[PDB]
Swiss-Prot record, chain A:
Alphabetized SUPFAM superfamilies for the sequence: ApaG-like (SSF110069), F-box domain (SSF81383), SMI1/KNR4-like (SSF160631)
Pfam families named in the record: DUF525, F-box-like, SMI1_KNR4
Described function: Substrate recognition component of the SCF (SKP1-CUL1-F-box protein)-type E3 ubiquitin ligase complex, SCF(FBXO3), which mediates the ubiquitination and subsequent proteasomal degradation of target proteins. Mediates the ubiquitination of HIPK2 and probably that of EP300, leading to rapid degradation by the proteasome. In the presence of PML, HIPK2 ubiquitination still occurs, but degradation is prevented. PML, HIPK2 and FBXO3 may act synergically to activate p53/TP53-dependent transactivation.
InterPro entries: ApaG_domain (IPR007474), ApaG_sf (IPR036767), F-box-like_dom_sf (IPR036047), F-box_dom (IPR001810), F-box_SCF_Substrate_Recog (IPR052121), Knr4/Smi1-like_dom (IPR018958), Knr4/Smi1-like_sf (IPR037883)
Protein name as annotated: F-box only protein 3
Keyword match Transferase: no
GO CC term (a single one): nucleus
Keywords linked to the UniProt accession: Host-virus interaction, Nucleus, Ubl conjugation pathway
Subcellular location: Nucleus
GO molecular function terms noted in the UniProt entry: ubiquitin-like ligase-substrate adaptor activity; ubiquitin-protein transferase activity
Known pathway: Protein modification; protein ubiquitination
Lineage: Eukaryota, Metazoa, Chordata, Craniata, Vertebrata
Record bears the keyword Nucleus: yes
Curated annotation (Swiss-Prot), chain B:
Pfam families the record matches: Skp1, Skp1_POZ
Name of the gene this protein is made from: SKP1
Cross-link type Glycyl lysine isopeptide (Lys-Gly) (interchain with G-Cter in SUMO1), residue numbers: K142
Gene Ontology terms describing biological process: chromatin remodeling; maintenance of protein location in nucleus; positive regulation of ubiquitin protein ligase activity; proteasome-mediated ubiquitin-dependent protein catabolic process; protein K48-linked ubiquitination; protein monoubiquitination; protein polyubiquitination; protein ubiquitination
Keyword Transport: no
Modifications after synthesis and translation: Undergoes autophagy-mediated degradation in the liver in a time-dependent manner.
Family: Belongs to the SKP1 family.
Annotated region described as Disordered, given as residue ranges: 63-83
UniProt name for this protein: S-phase kinase-associated protein 1
Biological role: Essential component of the SCF (SKP1-CUL1-F-box protein) ubiquitin ligase complex, which mediates the ubiquitination of proteins involved in cell cycle progression, signal transduction and transcription. In the SCF complex, serves as an adapter that links the F-box protein to CUL1. The functional specificity of the SCF complex depends on the F-box protein as substrate recognition component. SCF(BTRC) and SCF(FBXW11) direct ubiquitination of CTNNB1 and participate in Wnt signaling. SCF(FBXW11) directs ubiquitination of phosphorylated NFKBIA.
Annotated source species: Homo sapiens
Superkingdom of source: Eukaryota
Sample GO molecular function, one term: protein domain specific binding
CC terms in the record's Gene Ontology section: centrosome; Cul7-RING ubiquitin ligase complex; cytoplasm; cytosol; nucleoplasm; nucleus; PcG protein complex; SCF ubiquitin ligase complex
Pathway where this protein functions: Protein modification; protein ubiquitination
Amino acid sequence: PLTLESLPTDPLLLILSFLDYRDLINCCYVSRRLSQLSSHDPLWRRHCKKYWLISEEEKTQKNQCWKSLFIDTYSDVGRYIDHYAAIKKAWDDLKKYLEPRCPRMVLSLKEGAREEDLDAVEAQIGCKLPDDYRCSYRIHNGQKLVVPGLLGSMALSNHYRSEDLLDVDTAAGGFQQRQGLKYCLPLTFCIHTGLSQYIAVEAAEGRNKNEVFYQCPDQMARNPAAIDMFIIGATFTDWFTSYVKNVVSGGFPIIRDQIFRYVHDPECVATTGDITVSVSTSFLPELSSVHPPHYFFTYRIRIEMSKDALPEKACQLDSRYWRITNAKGDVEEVQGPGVVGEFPIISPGRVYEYTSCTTFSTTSGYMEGYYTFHFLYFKDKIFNVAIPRFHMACPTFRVSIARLEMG
Amino acid sequence: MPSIKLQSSDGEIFEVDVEIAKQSVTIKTMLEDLGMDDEGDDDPVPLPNVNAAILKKVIQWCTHHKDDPPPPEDDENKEKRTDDIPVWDQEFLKVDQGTLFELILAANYLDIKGLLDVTCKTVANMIKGKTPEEIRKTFNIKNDFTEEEEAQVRKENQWCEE
């Protein structure tokens, strides 16, 4: 004789608090009491502070009740409801970590791209964009073509890379449907070099749908459809959230007021004496190749002396002995005087950072070696500085299905 | 062992260890501010809003949770789910809807946080992911909406519709 409607207001509110948003709306059609209690404003607070990450301050600024906030948000980014809660969490983190850091990049960012533009893009390319990709470009259309970019940069002595996130319209204009790179859509452009961190809007040509890869042409093969890939992340959400985690976790150092793609491992430290050596590695898909295997790498070494050390222990570099080791076990050595044609000074307060290039011909690889400092005041005394055994790593490549079928 | 007497509306006198019965917030407040401070002469504490069987079930549950760790005091973004119910808690609550609802009423009266939380979790799990006809068939509620009210609520909530 006692049913769910006969329960008091507080246990019924506790029951409805555990329900999900579709169930809370689904309870509005059940009964008048459940319809009245489903529109309780705190009930749309567990469902709005997690599904859209709308905090208290946003509510107070918009002065709306919680259910009104939820319906207004679902009328805008609703169909991406299972992706928004992730993507904005990245997008509001990258835009936060860059607020005391490099401010020109977030100022270069455009505002949101309305659904009309994305529908026009889908009509132009003839395929359907991934829903999470649509949500991410709904929050921000990226930036106009300004160097430096948002997806990292890489600076050699001669080869400078900087990739900026591409808008919807330029992505549609640069969409590719040729043999090989079929149904692939660009997420960035480099202007300087021509990097195109493509995404696959349709599962074709050896690619599962919604995968993020670089464009590495087959130099050995003469087939125009022979394009090899350098898969970065699983999906668009995985790619962007991994990049944002790397940026905000300090994994990507900030150099020259840019974001750099220097994958630095904290294990690779071989501080000897008062001299602290720190090495960061990176990959460059423009100078790299698959057939023949080139697998280019760059590396920056952060050598410095602590200010705790007395200035009388002053030393200067004059050598770079390097034990390059590939996956075949081959060892090659260099002995040229001075790093990158320079003889730096390591002093209390001095921090020397230089970029250098290596050419590991196999997918794996690592280096080690010595600088063999010569002392400044005592011209005969030599100190020994050992570079840590940092382990290079190219991303998971994928030979083209054109080459795989060929033989 | 220190003890306390809980009396039902039916009249049955149950004996509960006071360290057990202190899990209920109301009894804890009563015996921390009024009861054990004065050392009442073991008179039965009447609980006129519960019956005998429901009192026996809350006593059984609370004895089963007499050594339960303190609950996590987190809400909002903690996202209290509906699947972390313990397996003995799942098996103990396997009763009909009337007994479950009387148990929820008893849990709200005695303010037992754990029992109220797990009973609300099971009731929510009986509702989560079902059509309104399925909800009204699983439970027993007649559609008090008229055609005008049904059209009004459909116009109000025709947004989750896909």
